[PDB]
Structure 1
């Protein structure tokens, strides 16, 4: 905004892991204000993935997170009718936000029987670079790679 007055709002930790990042993930996955459903879904998926992997929920989630997060994006800038695609860096908080949002949106578009199974399969795939989320990240990286001539 024109004023630049806002600050930052406090977020509560997750119920049974003591982590803020999982709480943010649950919030991203919530619809209509039904938080209990979202937290149960994510807990079930994390448990299934930990069983099928063996490491834990925490660092498995983290490992999937480094494989999807971006490092540079583009912004439009109109000049004379067309637009420059200028590349700019991404702050780490925005990196986490974009990673989680891409993960959730990719998982929502699948043909499994339950949302927990969808999310677990997608995030296990993304842990080793096979899903649609990593494809979106690669596309963003490629598009930012092409237009570096305007990167001042």
Structure 2
């Protein structure tokens, strides 16, 4: 009945970003947060070595491009079947940002995850790749059925 408070994650110790921590917890498998803490700090050294920019400048830029603005929600009042355009709450933006970032990074062709996650962030930051596309995809779809809401 009353919106449950989301769990207050700690800031990532080296970038002081609760966003970066949330990425670690998204990447973590079978409660192996160590593996994911390593992978990211390996991925961000890869980003900083290639770009020269701070990984935080790139990662925040990457999230901007992945983060959705409007989403499709199924509404079936009587008939309807209306894909109601819904504005993504700022918490659900980051959610879907990090979910897609990780989900598509794992699917990439590169051998190691630290490289796969680095390359998906670098592609996301350049407003390209698959995770940015996925945001576009649902917006193209939300624009397509925009006459409901």
TM-score normalised according to structure 2 size = 0.93
The equivalences for 1:7-22 within 5 A come to 7-22=5-20
Q: Secondary structure at the match of 1:9?
A: coil
State the aligned residue count: 149
Q: Which residue of 1 aligns with 2:86?
A: 88
Q: Which runs of 5+ in 1 are unaligned?
A: none
Aligned-partner Cα distance in 1 for 2:80–2:146: 17
Question: 129, 132, 135: which one pairs with 2:127?
Answer: 129
1:73 aligns with 2:75: no
Q: For 1:42 and 1:110, how far apart are their aligned partners in 2?
A: 16
Q: State the Cα RMSD in Å.
A: 1.4
Q: Is the CA contact 2:58–2:121 (under 8 Å) kept in the aligned structure 1?
A: no
In structure 2, the partner of 1:55 is 53
Which residue in 1 is equivalent to 2:137? 139
* Match among 31, 41, 44 for residue 42 of structure 2: 44
Structure 2 residue aligned with 1:113 = 111
Larger radius of gyration: 1
Relative to the length of structure 1, the TM-score reads 0.91
Structure 2 residue runs of 5 or longer lacking an equivalent are: none
Q: CA deviation at 1:63?
A: 1.0
